[PDB]
């Protein structure tokens, strides 16, 4: 009758005490007749009530997107607890359930290498600064770029890719004016992952 | 109850005359009590008759799967022709159609740059040779590594990532024993894409 979908928190929210990590239960295909759905949240089968149903929004196919959002503890998600979503109703014969948790296994620390642009990129107007991040488990990770403690926002990061040893890698690419790279400005690659000391490391990159 | 799935040809199959590119129409959850299936095929809305349809295959869940395969001309797919599979079935409300084509928009040449390992990495047993491929459109592309004309099979490539100018990039990572890199063996990164001359370029990498 209805498709239910359950989403983990963002990497960056579980790793920093100041941020707020949330699990997001999302029902699409809800027709006009049935208005309100009975969300029930459980942390290891044990019930918890810390919920918040975010009222509905309109759609281009006559159905409505009914969302719920459970705040969770940083150390609960990291330590691997099970987070069960249950949507009850009347227009469903039996009630639908969904269970997510952190991927299992020994966390592994990322190794973070910075890479300058290629000699052959050096003919262009904009150049490519590369941060290789490899050897990490699980795949949950965040990458950002800095110069003089100000965010550089002209970067893209690949999704994580499953390597031959069961660990993950990605590449982040920052594009900068060749003018900046030649003056000799320092650029930094910031990585946040559970297996890093204080969940944080940075590596600099500059023209040797 | 019946769902239709329509699969493009592989990137390499359309770029090389030697290969035979195919589009594939798969029908699933066909019923036991009403198993009669017809396929019609259209190329830019004009019907074509050369498709090769297989006999229905019983699955382990009391349902039939049926596959039809249309051979496409390389230049038709690269000229952006639309392939429509249409699937009919006596006991079904109305025919299920699906359409597929190469992604729309102007083609754009890949720039391929090779990157040696970070000196911070020149300490481990194994090092990472990096191939950066950026500025390409559409996202359909193939990447491989070699030394001395032999495939180097210890490689992983990222999926294509949408860059800020509307073009795609990715990276391919080749892991070699640190010793082979110190000797001075040449490694090569080859790329196939419709916007490259002869649909092909190769960029080599060695100790400097
Ligand atoms: C009516 O239309 C609506 C809306 O349509 C959409 O929006 C409109 C405006 C138009 O643009 C439409 O063209 C467009 O499609 C339909 O509602 C949609 O229903 C589909 C199902 O058909 C749902 O798709 C699922 O999506 C998830 C991924 O969703 C994230 O990423 C999307 C970005 O591409 C984004 O749209 C989503 O909102 C969502 O975003 C995340 O959400 C939270 C906030 O909610 C946030 O905290 C996150 O940070 C945010 N992240 C990002 C990056 O966006 C996808 O995973 C589902 O696929 C899984 O399940 C499938 C079937 O169950 C299966 O085919 C796949 O294999 C896949 O993976 C496995 O599946 C098994 C099988 O059950 C599963 O159990 C496993 O866990 C899983 N395994 C693994 C290892 O992963 C699925 O495809 C969308 O939720 C929904 N779209 C939107 C916009 O809400 C509605 O259905 C229409 N109705 C009709 C009748 O047509
Ligand atoms: C009864 O059994 C059958 C058969 O299953 C088999 O038998 C049972 C008993 C068990 O033994 C099973 O383990 C066994 O598999 C069930 O059949 C399945 O039904 C599901 C759907 O119900 C199908 O799902 C779709 O699969 C495709 C991907 O399919 C490729 O990869 C599969 C998994 O890796 C592989 O098994 C497939 O055969 C197929 O492989 C490809 O084959 C082609 C053709 O020859 C080949 O050239 C390719 O090389 C090859 N590729 C690979 C990698 O091998 C998946 O793409 C579908 O996803 C789309 O749609 C979803 C739902 O609509 C949606 O959630 C997704 O987001 C996605 O949507 C699309 O997204 C893209 C871009 O993002 C876009 O282009 C599209 O526009 C968009 N489409 C939308 C929104 O609609 C989907 O998951 C299985 O393939 C199918 N199994 C087989 C073998 O055919 C059946 O369901 C069972 N019945 C019941 C009642 O349970």
Numbering used by the authors:
A (entry chain B), B (entry chain A): 238 to 239, 239i, 240 to 444
Sentences from the study reporting this entry:
In addition, the insertions before and after S239 (i.e., C238i and C239i) showed a new feature: abolition of antibody-dependent cellular cytotoxicity (ADCC) due to non-binding of Fc gamma receptor IIIA (FcγRIIIA). In order to determine the structural basis for those findings and to provide a framework for further ADC engineering, we have analyzed the structure and dynamics of the Fc-C239i protein by X-ray diffraction and hydrogen deuterium exchange mass spectroscopy (HDX-MS). The crystal structure and dynamics of Fc-C239i with two different adducts, maleimide-PEG8 (polyethylene glycol-8) and cysteine, show how the IgG structure accommodates the insertion and binds the adducts, providing a model for the bound structure of one of the most common ADC linkers. In the two structures reported herein, a cysteine was inserted after Ser 239 (Fc-C239i) (for full sequence, see Section 2).
The two reported structures feature two different covalent adducts bound to the inserted cysteine. The cysteine-adduct and maleimide-adduct crystals diffracted to 0.23 nm and 0.27 nm resolutions, respectively. The inserted cysteine replaces Ser 239 and causes a 1-residue upward shift of Ser 239, Pro 238, and Gly 237. This enables Val 240 and all subsequent residues to maintain their wild-type locations. The new cysteine side chain points outward from the protein, into the solvent cleft between the A and B subunits. The new cysteine thiol appears accessible for conjugation to a linker/payload. The side chain of Ser 239 is now observed in the pocket formerly occupied by Pro 238, which has adequate volume but no H-bonding partner for the serine hydroxide. A wave of displacement then puts Pro 238 into the place normally occupied by Gly 237, formerly the last residue of the wild-type hinge. The observed location of Cys239i and the upward shift of residues Pro 238 and Ser 239 are similar in both chains of both adduct structures. The observed rearrangement of local structure adjacent to the C239i insertion provides an explanation for the previously reported loss of FcγR binding by Fc-C239i, by placing Pro 238 into the location where Gly 237 normally has an extended conformation that is incompatible with proline.
